[PDB]
Amino acid sequence: STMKFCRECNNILYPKEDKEQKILLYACRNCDHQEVADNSCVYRNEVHHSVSERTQILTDVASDPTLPRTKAVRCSKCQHREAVFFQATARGEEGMTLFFVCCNPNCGHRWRE
Amino acid sequence: TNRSTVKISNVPQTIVADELLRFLELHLGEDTVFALEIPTTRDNWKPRDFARVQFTTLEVKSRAQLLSSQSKLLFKTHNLRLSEAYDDIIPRPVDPRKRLDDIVLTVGFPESDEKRFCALEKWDGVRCWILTEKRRVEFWVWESGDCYKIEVRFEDIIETLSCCVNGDASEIDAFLLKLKYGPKVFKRVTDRYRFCKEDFDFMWIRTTDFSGSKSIGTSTCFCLEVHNGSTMLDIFSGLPYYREDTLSLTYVDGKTFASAAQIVPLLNAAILGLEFPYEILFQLNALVHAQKISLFAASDMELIKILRGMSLETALVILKKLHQQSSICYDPVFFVKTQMASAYKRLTEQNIMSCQRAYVTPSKIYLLGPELETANYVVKNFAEHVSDFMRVTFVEEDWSKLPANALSVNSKEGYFVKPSRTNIYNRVLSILGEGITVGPKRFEFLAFSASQLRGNSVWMFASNEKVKAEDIREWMGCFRKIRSISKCAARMGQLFSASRQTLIVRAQDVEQIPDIEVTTDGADYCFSDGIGKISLAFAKQ
Amino acid sequence: PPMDYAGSRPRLMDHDVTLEEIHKFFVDYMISDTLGVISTAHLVHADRDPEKARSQKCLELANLHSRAVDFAKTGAPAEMPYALKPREFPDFLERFEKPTYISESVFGKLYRAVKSSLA
Amino acid sequence: SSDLQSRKNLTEEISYGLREAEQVCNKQQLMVESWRDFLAVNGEDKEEDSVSDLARFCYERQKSATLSELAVSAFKDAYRDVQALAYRYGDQSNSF
Numbered sequence: 022s023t024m025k026f027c028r029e030c031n032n033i034l035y036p037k038e039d040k041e042q043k044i045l046l047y048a049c050r051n052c053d054h055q056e057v058a059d060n061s062c063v064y065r066n067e068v069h070h071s072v073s074e075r076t077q078i079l080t081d082v083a084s085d086p087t088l089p090r091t092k093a094v095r096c097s098k099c100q101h102r103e104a105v106f107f108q109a110t111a112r113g114e115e116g117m118t119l120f121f122v123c124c125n126p127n128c129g130h131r132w133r134e
Numbered sequence: 135t136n137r138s139t140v141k142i143s144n145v146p147q148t149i150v151a152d153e154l155l156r157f158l159e160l161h162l163g164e165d166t167v168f169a170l171e172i173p174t175t176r177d178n179w180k181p182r183d184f185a186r187v188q189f190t191t192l193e194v195k196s197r198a199q200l201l202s203s204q205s206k207l208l209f210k211t212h213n214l215r216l217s218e219a220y221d222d223i224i225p226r227p228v229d230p231r232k233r234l235d236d237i238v239l240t241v242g243f244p245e246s247d248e249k250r251f252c253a254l255e256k257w258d259g260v261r262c263w264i265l266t267e268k269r270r271v272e273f274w275v276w277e278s279g280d281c282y283k284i285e286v287r288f289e290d291i292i293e294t295l296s297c298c299v300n301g302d303a304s305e306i307d308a309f310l311l312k313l314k315y316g317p318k319v320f321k322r323v324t325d326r327y328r329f330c331k332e333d334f335d336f337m338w339i340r341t342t343d344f345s346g347s348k349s350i351g352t353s354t355c356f357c358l359e360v361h362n363g364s365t366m367l368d369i370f371s372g373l374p375y376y377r378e379d380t381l382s383l384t385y386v387d388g389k390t391f392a393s394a395a396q397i398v399p400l401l402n403a404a405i406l407g408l409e410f411p412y413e414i415l416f417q418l419n420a421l422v423h424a425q426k427i428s429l430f431a432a433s434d435m436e437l438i439k440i441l442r443g444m445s446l447e448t449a450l451v452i453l454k455k456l457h458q459q460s461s462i463c464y465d466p467v468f469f470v471k472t473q474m475a476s477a478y479k480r481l482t483e484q485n486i487m488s489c490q491r492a493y494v495t496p497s498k499i500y501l502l503g504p505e506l507e508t509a510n511y512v513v514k515n516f517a518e519h520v521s522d523f524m525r526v527t528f529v530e531e532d533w534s535k536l537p538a539n540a541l542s543v544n545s546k547e548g549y550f551v552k553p554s555r556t557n558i559y560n561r562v563l564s565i566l567g568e569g570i571t572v573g574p575k576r577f578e579f580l581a582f583s584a585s586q587l588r589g590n591s592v593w594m595f596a597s598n599e600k601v602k603a604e605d606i607r608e609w610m611g612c613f614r615k616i617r618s619i620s621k622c623a624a625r626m627g628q629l630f631s632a633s634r635q636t637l638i639v640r641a642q643d644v645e646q647i648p649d650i651e652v653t654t655d656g657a658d659y660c661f662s663d664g665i666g667k668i669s670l671a672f673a674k675q
Numbered sequence: 676p677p678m679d680y681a682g683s684r685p686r687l688m689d690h691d692v693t694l695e696e697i698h699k700f701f702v703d704y705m706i707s708d709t710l711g712v713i714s715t716a717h718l719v720h721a722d723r724d725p726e727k728a729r730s731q732k733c734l735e736l737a738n739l740h741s742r743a744v745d746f747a748k749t750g751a752p753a754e755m756p757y758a759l760k761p762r763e764f765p766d767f768l769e770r771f772e773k774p775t776y777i778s779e780s781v782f783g784k785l786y787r788a789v790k791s792s793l794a
Numbered sequence: 795s796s797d798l799q800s801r802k803n804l805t806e807e808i809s810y811g812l813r814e815a816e817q818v819c820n821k822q823q824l825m826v827e828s829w830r831d832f833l834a835v836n837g838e839d840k841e842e843d844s845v846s847d848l849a850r851f852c853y854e855r856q857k858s859a860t861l862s863e864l865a866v867s868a869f870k871d872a873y874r875d876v877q878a879l880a881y882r883y884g885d886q887s888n889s890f
């Protein structure tokens with residue numbers, strides 16, 4: 022996806038490989054001009070998943086899933102059974118630890134497993 | 135009749151604090167209401183069905199109660215019912231005489247044997263409230279904008295004395311407050327249903343000393359500069375153990391005794407500049423910490439010159455004799471003028487060791503001294519540096535357990551509640567990190583036992599050229615294998631229980647035998663947790 | 676049947692101890708330390724309601740007590756709820772400042788008997 | 795309302811209730827997998843950035859359907875209390 026124009030006729034260069042040369046070269050089909058390639062990179066693309074242009078708003082693609090909610094646990098500060106549970110790592114601990122977030126709009130309490 | 139705060143039973147939900155305040159001031163006297171607060175279930179828009187009102191004077195409260203009993207209070211077709219409240223909105227004394235404004239506050243200690251008082255730091259325009267019901271006295275000090283609250287309980291003050299500053303024996307312009315324990319220190323931090331009549335919309339969090347020179351930490355007495363106050367004697371007569379005698383003091387220039395270090399009440403080492411022994415210096419410092427001999431009375435050149443050249447045993451005997459008396463000694467030099475191997479065998483026979491015990495408080499530090507107690511396993515192989523071991527515990531000013539509110543007070547910031555560490559938390563961390571420097575020694579953290587964790591106590595060992603704290607720590611074992619903070623500390627402090635010595639067992643007489651484990655219903659149940667086997671010959675040995 | 680003895684998941688760090696996290700753990704043990712109040716609350720609640728040690732409140736108190744007694748080994752706070760505090764004390768307590776209520780359980784009978792014997 | 799003062803109090807109360815409901819909806823919108831690092835009990839320095847962007851929450855809610863449904867549910871739950879104020883500020887003789 023790297024396009025460059027040769028200095029002679031200002032036309033697009035096509036990458037090619039020569040077994041004898043054992044080096045990357047660029048030569049356009051308009052003039053018999055060959056230049057030494059740089060950085061040895063013929064394709065560089067940042068991976069993106071935005072293949073559905075102008076369609077992700079009307080149709081719910083669910084790119085960011087909602088966290089699950091459970092009613093078995095009971096909050097400490099308030100007697101509310103609804104909470105949000107998820108797995109995340111601690112500041113320096115190793116592994117995944119279950120976390121809880123209270124769903125009461127007036128409580129705002131979070132605790133670990 | 136104890137307090138002036140009254141709880142109103144039923145009020146209309148549509149009203150605001152201003153309307154109720156206007157109604158009360160119309161029915162009662164003008165501006166006779168101090169604090170009016172209506173609790174809200176929500177943040178600022180859902181008030182409750184009741185309210186609490188604090189009156190300025192008890193007579194207004196009695197009149198309001200009489201009006202309520204006669205059903206003469208009708209505010210928006212609602213009959214207000216008045217009842218007693220559990221607590222006051224603002225801890226403010228009812229008596230206007232107790233409230234003292236714009237008075238000079240100074241701290242110090244009885245530096246000289248005679249009636250001489252040394253002033254460390256003087257604060258002007260402080261506020262003093264005497265709360266008889268709460269059995270405490272509040273001092274509000276404004277320093278660099280933010281104000282601080284100093285609370286002195288009745289138990290803290292051991293005796294009350296009255297003095298004069300103008301120089302007239304008949305006049306009484308000062309009051310000495312001999313404090314045994316340190317005072318609590320607070321700090322101020324930064325409306326539709328709260329009138330409050332003033333700017334009391336803040337909170338108090340416990341903090342360390344705010345003085346630059348740490349005058350409060352090194353001062354065991356408080357002096358209240360006041361006017362003639364002929365009628366003030368009756369108010370000051372309520373303080374416990376009041377002396378009905380007239381005494382005069384003399385101000386002494388004692389601004390030299392100012393330490394910027396965290397550990398305030400310790401003596402300066404550069405003043406000595408000699409080869410003074412560590413044990414005698416520690417005993418003298420512990421005596422100074424106790425309410426026996428003042429700092430300036432023990433910092434004189436004559437006393438240290440006398441104590442420098444003398445037999446060690448007689449010096450220790452006279453020091454413990456001076457410490458044993460309950461009465462305060464003003465001139466220890468006159469007292470000491472008028473007055474005039476085994477550790478290893480004790481360890482082997484009953485494990486008797488003299489362990490130094492230290493108490494760390496937010497205001498100051500208390501040294502108990504070489505108290506005899508039982509011995510652990512570490513001192514068995516480290517019986518040379520007995521004085522290097524020091525037991526350090528963290529308590530409050532009254533030597534009680536630190537409350538949870540004094541460390542990491544909760545606060546709601548943002549969406550969730552995030553705790554905010556107090557200055558006492560940082561002070562404890564700094565003490566654990568830097569360590570305690572007593573005389574020609576510096577104590578570092580070794581470990582804490584399982585029992586000491588509950589008691590908020592820890593062991594500290596002074597590093598020496600032959601052996602350091604890290605040397606002992608690595609001699610005990612390698613704890614890097616443990617990846618759990620609690621588990622590693624528990625294992626490191628596990629080998630500190632008292633035990634009796636016996637013969638040494640080599641590493642070649644060992645064996646590995648399989649254990650038993652059964653898993654039923656998806657539960658791991660192990661029978662062999664700490665069981666073992668022993669022979670009869672080994673048991674006899 | 677007895678309660679389950681399954682403890683909390685251990686917390687393993689990705690690096691060695693730098694001698695500061697142990698200090699942080701020691702200082703943080705002073706806060707969120709409800710070992711002594713859980714037993715008193717459980718005793719008061721058992722004294723108050725009938726069929727003691729059978730309701731879910733007593734089971735929750737026992738679970739909290741187990742989690743608090745496991746705090747010394749595993750760094751898991753007990754998280755004592757505010758609504759579970761007793762707020763009332765029987766006659767056989769030294770908290771004279773706190774409100775004292777008359778107890779009619781076996782402990783109250785023992786206290787009445789010992790008071791009558793000493794008087 | 796009985797008088798003008800009651801009407802003013804009701805208006806202020808409604809405004810504060812609507813503000814509280816909006817804040818509740820903003821808090822509820824965070825219950826997604828993208829904020830699991832912020833919702834955990836740790837040390838995050840981006841606490842102020844979550845509350846500084848007030849106008850971005852509306853744009854995010856309008857673009858996402860799941861976020862819109864969550865915000866609607868939270869708004870109804872918070873607005874039940876606001877609707878409850880009519881009984882406090884309403885007379886018994888009111889025809890409605």
Ligand SMILES: [Zn+2]
Pocket residue numbers: 027028029030031032049051052053054
């Ligand atoms: Zn070309």
Ligand SMILES: [Zn+2]
Pocket residue numbers: 096097098099100101123124125128129130
């Ligand atoms: Zn909750």
